[PDB]
UniProtKB/Swiss-Prot annotation, chain A:
Protein name, entry field: 26S proteasome non-ATPase regulatory subunit 4
Sequence ranges assigned to domain VWFA in this UniProt record: 5-188
Described function: Component of the 26S proteasome, a multiprotein complex involved in the ATP-dependent degradation of ubiquitinated proteins. This complex plays a key role in the maintenance of protein homeostasis by removing misfolded or damaged proteins, which could impair cellular functions, and by removing proteins whose functions are no longer required. Therefore, the proteasome participates in numerous cellular processes, including cell cycle progression, apoptosis, or DNA damage repair.
Organism (species): Homo sapiens (Human)
Source organism, top-level taxon: Eukaryota
GO biological process: proteasome-mediated ubiquitin-dependent protein catabolic process
Cellular component annotations (GO), alphabetically ordered: cytosol; nucleoplasm; nucleus; proteasome accessory complex; proteasome complex; proteasome regulatory particle, base subcomplex
Cross-link (Glycyl lysine isopeptide (Lys-Gly) (interchain with G-Cter in SUMO2)): K122
GO molecular-function terms, A-Z: identical protein binding; molecular adaptor activity; polyubiquitin modification-dependent protein binding; RNA binding
Family to which this protein belongs: Belongs to the proteasome subunit S5A family.
UniProtKB/Swiss-Prot annotation, chain B:
Glycyl lysine isopeptide (Lys-Gly) (interchain with G-Cter in ubiquitin) crosslink site(s): K50
Originating gene: PSMD7
Record's subunit section: Component of the 19S proteasome regulatory particle complex. The 26S proteasome consists of a 20S core particle (CP) and two 19S regulatory subunits (RP). The regulatory particle is made of a lid composed of 9 subunits including PSMD7, a base containing 6 ATPases and few additional components. Within the complex, PSMD7 interacts with subunit PSMD4 through their respective MPN domain. Interacts with TRIM5.
UniProt similarity note: Belongs to the peptidase M67A family.
Protein name per UniProt: 26S proteasome non-ATPase regulatory subunit 7
Superkingdom: Eukaryota
Function, as annotated: Component of the 26S proteasome, a multiprotein complex involved in the ATP-dependent degradation of ubiquitinated proteins. This complex plays a key role in the maintenance of protein homeostasis by removing misfolded or damaged proteins, which could impair cellular functions, and by removing proteins whose functions are no longer required. Therefore, the proteasome participates in numerous cellular processes, including cell cycle progression, apoptosis, or DNA damage repair.
Species the sequence originates in: Homo sapiens
Miscellaneous comment in the UniProt entry for this protein: Does not bind a metal ion.
Curated annotation (Swiss-Prot), chain D:
Superkingdom per UniProt: Eukaryota
Organism (species): Homo sapiens (Human)
Function noted in UniProt: Component of the 26S proteasome, a multiprotein complex involved in the ATP-dependent degradation of ubiquitinated proteins. This complex plays a key role in the maintenance of protein homeostasis by removing misfolded or damaged proteins, which could impair cellular functions, and by removing proteins whose functions are no longer required. Therefore, the proteasome participates in numerous cellular processes, including cell cycle progression, apoptosis, or DNA damage repair.
Quaternary structure and interacting proteins, as annotated: Component of the 19S proteasome regulatory particle complex. The 26S proteasome consists of a 20S core particle (CP) and two 19S regulatory subunits (RP). The regulatory particle is made of a lid composed of 9 subunits, a base containing 6 ATPases including PSMC3 and few additional components. Interacts with PAAF1.
PTMs per UniProt: Sumoylated by UBE2I in response to MEKK1-mediated stimuli.
Subcellular localization: Cytoplasm; Nucleus
Gene of this entry: PSMC3
Name of the protein: 26S proteasome regulatory subunit 6A
Entry similarity comment: Belongs to the AAA ATPase family.
Swiss-Prot record, chain E:
The protein's name: 26S proteasome non-ATPase regulatory subunit 14
Role noted for this protein: Component of the 26S proteasome, a multiprotein complex involved in the ATP-dependent degradation of ubiquitinated proteins. This complex plays a key role in the maintenance of protein homeostasis by removing misfolded or damaged proteins, which could impair cellular functions, and by removing proteins whose functions are no longer required. Therefore, the proteasome participates in numerous cellular processes, including cell cycle progression, apoptosis, or DNA damage repair.
Family to which this protein belongs: Belongs to the peptidase M67A family. PSMD14 subfamily.
Cystine residue pairs: none
Gene: PSMD14
Motif (JAMM motif): 52-61
Tissues where this protein is expressed: Widely expressed. Highest levels in heart and skeletal muscle.
Binding residue positions for Zn(2+): H52, H54
Domain of life, per lineage: Eukaryota
Full-protein positions shown: 62 to 122 of 310
Subunit composition and interactions: Component of the 19S proteasome regulatory particle complex. The 26S proteasome consists of a 20S core particle (CP) and two 19S regulatory subunits (RP). The regulatory particle is made of a lid composed of 9 subunits including PSMD4, a base containing 6 ATPases and few additional components. Within the complex, PSMD4 interacts with subunit PSMD7 through their respective MPN domain. Interacts with TXNL1.
Organism of origin: Homo sapiens
Signal sequence segment: none
Amino acid sequence: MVLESTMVCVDNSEYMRNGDFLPTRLQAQQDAVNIVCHSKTRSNPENNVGLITLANDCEVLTTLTPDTGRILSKLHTVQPKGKITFCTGIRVAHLALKHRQGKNHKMRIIAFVGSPVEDNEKDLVKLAKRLKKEKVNVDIINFGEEEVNTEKLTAFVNTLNGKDGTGSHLVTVPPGPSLADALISSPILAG
Amino acid sequence: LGLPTEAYISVEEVHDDGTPTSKTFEHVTSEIGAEEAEEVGVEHLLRDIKDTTVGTLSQRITNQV
Amino acid sequence: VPGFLQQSQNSGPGQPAVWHRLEELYTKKLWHQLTLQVLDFVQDPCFAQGDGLIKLYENFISEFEHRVNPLSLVEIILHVVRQMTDPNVALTFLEKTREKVKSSDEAVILCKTAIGALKLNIGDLQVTKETIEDVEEMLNNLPGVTSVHSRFYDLSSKYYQTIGNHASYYKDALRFLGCVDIKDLPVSEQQERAFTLGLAGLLGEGVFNFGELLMHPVLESLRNTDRQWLIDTLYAFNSGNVERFQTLKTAWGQQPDLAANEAQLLRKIQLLCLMEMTFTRPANHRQLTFEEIAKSAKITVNEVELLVMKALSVGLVKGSIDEVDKRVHMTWVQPRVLDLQQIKGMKDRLEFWCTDVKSMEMLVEHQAHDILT
Amino acid sequence: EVLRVTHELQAMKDKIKENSEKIKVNKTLPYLVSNVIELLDVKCAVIKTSTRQTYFLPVIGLVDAEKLKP
Amino acid sequence: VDDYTVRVIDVFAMPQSGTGVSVEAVDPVFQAKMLDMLKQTGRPEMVVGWYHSHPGFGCWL
């Protein structure tokens, strides 16, 4: 019911292609977004979710839309053939978020971190600092091979909203056989 | 001076002469024209600063300076 | 599987290190860091005698890989094929790998250069050019590999081991060097590319541009000691001077492929020599007295008449020849590559030109101020 | 993937419907009953209206050319 | 802007329809959506009037 626009950032880098998760990472993201996108619209029928690919560039494949069909359909042919750039991904997701057609929805972002992020620790925190000022809650969930609970990533979520913040979770998924059930249990119903 | 439009394309070539490849914007000749309908509107729209089409000695010389 | 890499674990420096290090990755269903080491361990200095084991290991690994790069596959099967050294099945084998990854990934050219690599040694002409053309027509919509070009260029460099591939080689040899920039190959690899290029450029029928002589990072930077005469001779052609002591001094070296074409090369230098002079001309005095042309190229006056006849024939000039005075009036439509000093000199002239264009503008605006309106 | 094909069909059905609606509101009435006189080739026909005026049509219009006959 | 001045800045064509130039020709879905999208670009103007051509007939209603 909480009016919020979920700008889901789905990874499509090359490492996203090795299936430490049973069938493949992508289906995990592709299955995962299926629930997060569906989770938000079910919670509130006035909601809207868009997706930003994060590898090799920051494409905006589907702008912020309520209809979940477009997000699901666009997921296909996501073609994981790039290198993740999370430094810019959040900005473009937020900058696109700033174009919210309705100005009332709260802000909530879901990032699909599935590759090793090569970002200076100082840069990530400064990005987090800009998010704090502008009151956007972003959830980070990690997939596939990556320095488990990257220190750069973990510092990001903590400064994301601390001092008794909303708790934009850095939900770390158990690598190995696991569906979005971990991604749906904790983050999807509570972010 | 004039021509407030500059038109560019996208070409990705091997730069024949042994140099790195890149995206780059190639240039395409630009020219400003008018179809009949807009032409009638534009001609009236100025209607206060348009120069005589005949030119005359005064305007021809200014065409050279 | 794990046992097989255990049994064929040998043949790599640090048997456990070479193989079992990556084995930890395959268990956790990942397929990238393996190949690069696989390519690196196939790039690892070895006879690749474990090729049959590595082939099977690669084949076994590639059989249930379904993730590793077909570049490494080809790079390893080529290292394989360069190591199995069995061209008879290499074509057949490379084709099956190609067909087994039939998406847009451009591995067939490498297989075409694999048929290249092995059919450029067996049956090297009939359809190889087709093996090129099919690649060239297909090699569109994605300029990201840069090896599709090179093997064709290299196969055209191997096809450079044909009659009508010199300028095609030089034009393509320059093209390749742009695609791959860094050393990323032995100084021997780079200096080899420069020598066969310059030796081609000085030999190419349709090439007297020589623009990249000084501006090409490889040929210019490389080859400072190893047969540096080429940079001098290559620099010579941009100057056109007689220099025939050098051509002789470099004649002591590079005896093959240069003596056989001294008649052609001398004609080339004569041809450029004219373009050199009419560039050095003071512009206004664009005419060239027969004596001055004959003295520069040390060619008798009876043949300066025909030298200009050629150079103007191919398209390196758009002038006209006089005989009563025998001054060849010159008008150029064939420009040459430039240089810092040339450009510095070219700009200094242009500063004068804008000075005059400015002066005459003031002498008109001031004069006709009343009429200017 | 079956759902994805269904989504593409559902979108196609709306656009087919939207194009059909624009054609439907542009069909309208009344029609001047004319008499196709010929068909020059160079999809364009020379209609001779019943009002005794001829009018070459650059595009034959909302019909299949092959159906239209002199 | 006031009683003595009606300022028109931009015009947007309402798609030609078989009705002609009539109230019915004003497609409420087309106008409501187009206005909504022109508001994002920086033109939050109000519908100040309507225009229609008159192929040679003159300037009369």
